[PDB]
RNA sequence: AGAC
């Protein structure tokens, strides 16, 4: 019933065959009941799995991550969750699609919690049908869901900094292991101990992915320690997965802010992708998932709900209406809608910041609400003292449009500028005007 | 930390 006009959500477990199986399935129903369709990958990694899927459909890549021949006649079209969300922003030509499929429909990155929100909406005002895919529908607070084995769920201490004793458990045992971490610095020092201990250890994160992923699949490895960036588009042949069940966040303190916040627990749905990683094989029983603590009862405080609403806020529906985030998660922020709607001018500037600048939406909206125009990059230097940016622990310095050497102090202070050494020297240039 |  792909032309009622509802939103489906098909909960379906890890190992499932939620895109080598059910996403062509409804594809090629699609494609026979002749409506234009969209789906929505959470990120390139998963947009690649999903063409080999579809391999052979006619599906329009809007991503660079897939490079196949169109034919110009194709309905359906595939991209990201987030470009899906940046080209709503745009005063492009929004294409009336009849069914809009999202997979990993749990998914907090602000542009994914924006994109279900105009989805939702859409369904709700009775113009288009949705499919969301999931192992976690938003609203269900499951750490736990089905798999294709059986799976041992145990709670223990897991070490989070390196030891020399006391957790032999760890090293003593004779399969292979993804160890789950909040950071990069974190996973290191785990991954150096492990390496003394004289186990074989590939690193993940996003920075070393491309490369790194791959090993796992050609080498003989003991563990893979890695951050949540293995949560989607990562699968392994493992037997353990330890979970400290922490992860790093932001969050906005006092409105003025934005932190990256933790460690700090994971939500059910990351937890659950985490322990999916294992029991994928229903022929090799006995696969353990040993995991660190609980997870997070509160998900308010991430900035991501507020950051979904300063983008859908923006989106312009028919007639300046706006929508509404996706009814299960509206409750996780408390802002009227609205409130973050920006005039012509300011919006514009806003779009290009997070578009053009890399800027997160937080600080986006900051600067643009506060009539600075986008090239105007002095804001980057006349905060307060302790608003000065650090690199290599003295003040970072960057040589301006104006030929001028000058401290980096931007006026609102958000983390993610400057958390890591990609994120520092993209603002660096940013700031420079180049 | 993740993301286009």
Request: hydrophobic share 40%; charged share 25%.
């Amino acid at each position: 019933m792909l032309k009622k006009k509802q939103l489906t959500v098909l909960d379906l477990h890890p190992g499932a065959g939620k895109t080598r199986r059910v996403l062509p399935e409804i594809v090629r129903e699609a494609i026979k009941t002749r409506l234009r369709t969209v789906i929505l990958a959470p990120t390139r990694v998963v947009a690649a799995e999903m063409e080999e899927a579809l391999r052979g459909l006619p599906v329009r890549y809007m991503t660079t991550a897939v490079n196949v021949t169109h034919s110009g006649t194709e309905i359906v079209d595939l991209m990201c969750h987030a470009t899906f969300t940046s080209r709503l922003l745009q005063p492009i030509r929004v294409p009336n699609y009849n069914l809009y499929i999202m997979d990993e429909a749990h998914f907090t990155d602000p542009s994914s919690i924006a994109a279900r929100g105009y989805i939702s909406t859409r369904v709700e005002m009775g113009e288009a049908a949705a499919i969301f895919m999931t192992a976690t529908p938003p609203g269900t607070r499951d750490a736990f869901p089905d798999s294709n084995s059986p799976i041992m769920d145990t709670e223990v201490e897991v070490p989070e900094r390196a030891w020399s004793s006391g957790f032999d458990w760890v090293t003593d045992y004779s399969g292979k292991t993804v160890w789950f971490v909040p950071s990069v610095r974190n996973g290191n020092e785990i991954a150096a101990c492990l390496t003394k201990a004289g186990k074989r250890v590939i690193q993940l994160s996003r920075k070393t992915f491309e490369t790194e992923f791959q090993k796992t699949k050609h080498q003989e490895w003991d563990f893979v320690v890695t951050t949540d960036i293995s949560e989607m588009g990562a699968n392994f042949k493992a037997d353990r997965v330890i979970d400290s069940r922490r992860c790093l966040k932001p969050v906005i303190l006092d409105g003025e802010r934005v932190i990256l916040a933790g460690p700090m627990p994971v939500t059910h749905a990351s937890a659950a992708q985490r322990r999916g990683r294992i029991g994928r094989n229903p022929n090799k029983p006995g696969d353990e998932y040993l995991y660190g603590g609980g997870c997070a009862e509160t998900d308010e405080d991430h900035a991501h709900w507020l950051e979904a609403r300063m983008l859908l806020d923006n989106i312009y529906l028919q007639d300046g209406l706006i929508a509404s985030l996706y009814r299960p998660e509206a409750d996780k922020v408390a802002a009227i809608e609205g409130e973050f709607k920006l005039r012509t001018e300011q919006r514009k500037t806003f779009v290009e910041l997070m578009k053009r600048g890399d800027l997160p939406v937080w600080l986006a909206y900051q600067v643009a609400s506060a009539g600075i125009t986008y090239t105007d990059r002095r804001w980057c230097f006349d905060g307060t003292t302790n608003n000065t940016i650090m690199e290599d622990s003295v003040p970072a310095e960057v040589w301006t449009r104006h030929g001028e050497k000058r401290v980096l102090k931007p006026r609102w202070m958000d983390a993610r500028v400057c958390s890591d050494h990609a994120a520092l020297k993209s603002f660096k240039e940013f700031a420079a005007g180049k």
